[PDB]
Amino acid sequence: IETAIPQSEMTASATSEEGQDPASSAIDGNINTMWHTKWNGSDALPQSLSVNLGKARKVSSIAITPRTSGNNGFITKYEIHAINNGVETLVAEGTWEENNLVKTVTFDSPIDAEEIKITAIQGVGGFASIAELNVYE
Ligand SMILES: OC[C@H]1O[C@@H](O)[C@H](O)[C@@H](O)[C@H]1O
């Protein structure tokens, strides 16, 4: 048993976004639209995407769907922080491969969080992109 938090209950924000690729496009249920930092490369990494969850949640996993086409912004090095009451705390970090496969992060002990922040430390082309982000309880 695991349950998907409705993305419609989420709101998204990013420190860098191309006009065509806003933070909100990371949570619209469409793998053809992405969040992407600004194409002109002016916002050097790290850049981040914050997703507010709507209420206090107990999250057991996160699925990070890369762009369905192209490679620019495949995140290769990341951090994940959670915001709860309203303390911010580092909860995941590592390296991801250079491909378009969904990247999962699982919490054996489910974490309390009202908001999650994905920080892209390194990414291809010096960009960060996420086509879809889902959060599971
Ligand atoms: O300049 C950066 C841009 O490059 C394009 O080729 C790509 O389709 C966009 O997603 C964006 O990454």
Ligand SMILES: [Ca+2]
């Ligand atoms: Ca999307």
